[PDB]
């Protein structure tokens, strides 16, 4: 199993970022998200399809529909610059699948 | 046989294959070992109890529509007054034993809702669909 | 959303019926074994235990239903075994006893309740004095004023072969393998087993006669130490060997008492009469008490320990009753306990044949004599002690006394079931999820 | 809740096996599944494999001919060995604690506390 | 075994509950757990064995009909009005349902096998 | 309930009809209600065992993923070490009795393999 | 082993056993009979 994801997106400060992924049956399989700061281990941003864990700002939320999935970051801050990844678990293979990571830049 | 010192999430990842060992143990193997009113009537009574317990569990899975299922999802929503915790505390911090104890007081409510909906309201809906 | 799961590894405390599994084969045919083989399940080849990582449980040696189930099978089988045997009721007549320590063994002239022809016949038999009431020189057997005394059948052997207790499917037995568990409270290192280890169904009082040992040091367990009325069970980590004998060469005779049935008694003694003594090494016994007193003192801080003497008016409680070859030896333990600790041994015994086993009423078993002489030996592995109580001296005199007394056979069984608990498996459960 | 601590050889040769061990100072090994994740410099994340103390183990197909995972519950730690490690296997090797919820056909798992990773350099 | 509506539960209201099917195969377990002398013991054991046997016989019949997984099962068998009829409103609004027993015990008594044997 | 000496092919053809009679109940309808101290205990033992046999067959088939069906195609390949005979000869020269005897010593193995392979189906 | 349990002696005077009932007016039973009297040989005087 493989995920589709754009290499990058740029946004202005204060705007909402739309960071996306997709693939087959994304509606059937839950898609969770990670944020990676350069030099750091990735931190879970969204668990399950849209649940924000403690420590993640209220500006972060997610949604799943059809063959696509989206990470929404409102009011982007300069500190949000990171590579954002999607992850799914292929239950038919135990194939853990990561997207490439969208490089998100706040201008 | 199991672990159960593990969290619900971890323990259940293998339920597909841990189950069907526990199930098997209820009926198979012991009954080959036993092919041999002190140790008479008591063994007969033990056999009867094992059968009665077995059928109770199968009947409930059947009444709830989980026929042949190890894991089944139905139409009854979770009532948040029960274990009003985050999903993660329930699945990743608590073990199955601890969990069953916390909601032991709601077992009757959960089971009654499962019966009213699954295979009950659902089957009256199917009789209507099959009228054509 | 509600998701239903089956095969969930959850258990609750439960009480159920356990199976008797025998140890390999003792399927003798000349004499059948009774405690083992009789209606028992073949050995399940050594299964492995399963350790449950990080699972902690609350074990309790007291109020342990496995002890109660062992008790009931033992009592029930004892009675079922004896039931189909000859009544000795026809022997409950006046005896005229002349004797042959002096009158240890009574030589009694007996008028037979006639068994066949309903015309009088006479015979004689030897008895130990402990079976006779001196009620003008008129003697009667002791339990004829209570109930029917039955002779144990020669084809039945009450040999204490270890029995494994096995759970029925759907149930499991948890075992506490934690170190120095004191019989109560939480235990880590909990494993699940299919059956218990074999427990040798030894019946004794005032001294354990065989069993398992403590792992590192003497372990003293009680439900409550403060309450002097509780029994303190002391398990040793080293075995002390006890040697018991009856050096009296007996000639057996068979007396007809009923159509189809015979009574077995002793006709004559060959050679001189000797006491049925038991021997314990002096050194091992003193070292054993030293260790007990040390651990017991840790529980009873800063006091001298005394063991003193067994006391009561009932031999069933007062003396140990070692079962040696099928005969019952009631032994004097004074020589073992009448000492204190503040930083061979020969024991006289007597032989008794009519026993209201289990210290109950309404029944008694008659043990026929064994031809020739006998010898047996065993590993003591543990003692049963009680505390003497308080005083008006307010313990300024220390000398805390722990008497060599028991009197309840469920303690023997409890001493090897402290490691086990019965639970039931409940495979169904539910949890919140996010689906349909 | 859980702090993971990485260790490893650093530089290894192109024909040698790589052996990495992560300890857990948080929770017991027996409570959760443990996972290994690889990140070559300049690349995204690649899953290596998972293990649970009861022997339930699996791997990403790309490494199956060369990889094994084991745990040791007495030291509360776990380890990864990759055989015949070459220059192409230079990467940061991460440890993480896996959480989950079990649904009938779409099991969901997450890597929630992460160690910071150890860089393994592979060269002559 | 509340049996609410056992008489005149419309007939169709009875069918919105069907909650008494979880008693005959389950309450016996509870009775045995509460208990946890051959004069009473053999008879009581016989009663337990029979309760199980009766339960299983009904399950076996539902299996043959292809109804074992259902609480409500529509089979491909036309109702035969030569045995008994009235309007469906009377049937569904006024439950007794005993008028059918002599005839049905033979009609469906036989059809359960005929239907499955000739199903496809 | 004949054709015992017939070949496997012939006997399994329309297995279902023969099976419905065999499986109409172990005791059919409680010995078709025709039959509705030691004699009593021996009969209770007989009745209990009949119940256990019924349930064991149903449970095992359910574990293997065969339920409501009499003939099931599984995920376990045939190992020639169990038997290495032409597919045609076992089906048209051999009878079911002969066949069951031929592979009697592989029963435990095949059944164990079926439980593992059939349990590993995601579920 | 067979003991017979019997009476030894009577202490003090010997007296006849008896049961006391007091001024019971069970006329309401008679009135129920009166209701069913019509069936029981028509309306008649009721005697015990
Ligand atoms: C109650 O009755 C029991 C008997 O029922 C009696 O038991 C004796 O107890 C004493 C201690 O008090 C034991 O003494 C020890 O003996 C050790 C030597 O014996 C070992 O080897 C035996 C065989 O080989 C030797 O002997 C044969 C002749 O038989 C000879 O040809 C060989 O060349 C060789 O020398 C072996 O039989 C014996 O026992 C085993 O095997 C028998 C088989 O029938 C079995 O029944 C036993 O259960 C057991 O498995 C044993 O293996 C000796 O090494 C040992 O030394 C240590 O202690 C001394 C203490 O002073 C130290 O100085 C020394 O450095 C060592 O640390 C010690 O001397 C004796 O062996 C027992 N005998 C028997 C038959 O069991 C009790 O004393 C009686 N008690 C009372 C209160 O009455
Ligand atoms: C067979 O033997 C029984 C005795 O075993 C005997 O029973 C007596 O029968 C007479 C006649 O019916 C009863 O008399 C009536 O009592 C009514 C008042 O009852 C209350 O007060 C009683 C007395 O109170 C004193 O003692 C209490 C002690 O605790 C104290 O507090 C008070 O302050 C006071 O000093 C009291 O005993 C009684 O208790 C009831 O509950 C106990 C519970 O254990 C139970 O054991 C008792 O038996 C009793 O049920 C209660 O609290 C009184 O109102 C009534 O008078 C009216 O009715 C008559 C109807 O004829 C009118 O004529 C009258 O004008 C009033 O309207 C009457 O006096 C007496 O109480 C019975 N019990 C005792 C112990 O004496 C049977 O008669 C005998 N039968 C035969 C055929 O021989
Ligand atoms: C009880 O006493 C017997 C001796 O009659 C001990 O049995 C021997 O134990 C040794 C191991 O220490 C074995 O090598 C011998 O083969 C055993 N002999 C026999 C006849 O079984 C027994 O170990 C003692 N039990 C305890 C708990 O100490
Ligand atoms: C076992 O679980 C208890 C739970 O409180 C924990 O304190 C203990 O450290 C655990 N033991 C290990 C080493 O897993
Ligand atoms: C027992 O007493 C009788 C006389 O009553 C005598 O003949 C018999 O020899 C005595 N038995 C023994 C063993 O001395
Ligand atoms: C026993 O015999 C002696 C000697 O004849 C006699 O003195 C004694 O009184 C007798 N026993 C009883 C109870 O009378
Ligand atoms: C836990 O139990 C097992 C089995 O009894 C044992 O091997 C192990 O040493 C124990 N560990 C302890 C004592 O913590
Ligand atoms: C029993 O424990 C004591 C503790 O003081 C020790 O000295 C002794 O050696 C132990 N016995 C055995 C047989 O190991
Ligand atoms: C046994 O040890 C526990 C602590 O592990 C203690 O709470 C309990 O009181 C002790 N038992 C007795 C009889 O004192
Ligand atoms: C043990 O022997 C002594 C000897 O002085 C005696 O006083 C004591 O009563 C005897 N004990 C028993 C139980 O017979
Ligand atoms: C036991 O108690 C008695 C008093 O009843 C006393 O005379 C004796 O010396 C005591 N024995 C020991 C060993 O203290």
Author numbering:
A (entry chain N): 1 to 107
B (entry chain F): 523 to 558, 569 to 664
C (entry chain D): 35 to 134, 150 to 184, 188 to 310, 313 to 323, 323A, 324 to 355, 357 to 397, 413 to 463, ...
D (entry chain M): 1 to 82, 82A, 82B, 82C, 83 to 100, 100A, 100B, 100C, ...
E (entry chain B): 523 to 558, 568 to 651
F (entry chain E): 523 to 558, 569 to 655
G (entry chain A): 314 to 323, 323A, 324 to 355, 357 to 361
Tell me what the authors wrote about this structure, in their words.
The cryo-EM complex of ACS122 and ACS114 Fabs bound to AMC009 SOSIP was reconstructed to a resolution of ~4.0 Å and contained three ACS114 Fabs and two ACS122 Fabs interacting with the AMC009 SOSIP trimer. Specifically, ~92% (1459 Å2) of the total average buried surface area (BSA) is contributed by ACS114 HC, 82% (1190 Å2) of which consists of interactions with Env glycans. The epitope of ACS114 overlaps to a large extent with the epitopes of silent face-targeting bNAbs VRC-PG05 and SF12; however, the epitope of ACS114 is located slightly higher up on the trimer showing subtle differences in recognition of the silent face epitope. The high-resolution cryo-EM structure revealed that ACS122 binds an epitope surrounding the gp120-gp41 interface with an average buried surface area (BSA) of 1246 Å2, 86% (1068 Å2) of which is contributed by the ACS122 HC. The majority of the interactions are via ACS122 HC variable loops that interact with the gp41 fusion peptide proximal region (FPPR) and HR2 region. The cryo-EM structure also demonstrated that ACS122 uses its long CDRH3 to disrupt the tryptophan clasp at the base of the trimer, akin to bNAb 3BC315 and vaccine-elicited rabbit bNAb 1C2 that both cause the trimer to dissassemble.
Here, HIV-1 envelope glycoproteins (Env)-specific IgG+ B cells were isolated at various time points post infection from an HIV-1 infected elite neutralizer to obtain monoclonal antibodies (mAbs). High-resolution cryo-electron microscopy structures of the neutralizing mAbs (NAbs) in complex with an Env trimer generated from the same individual revealed that the NAbs used multiple strategies to neutralize the virus; blocking the receptor binding site, binding to HIV-1 Env N-linked glycans, and disassembly of the trimer.
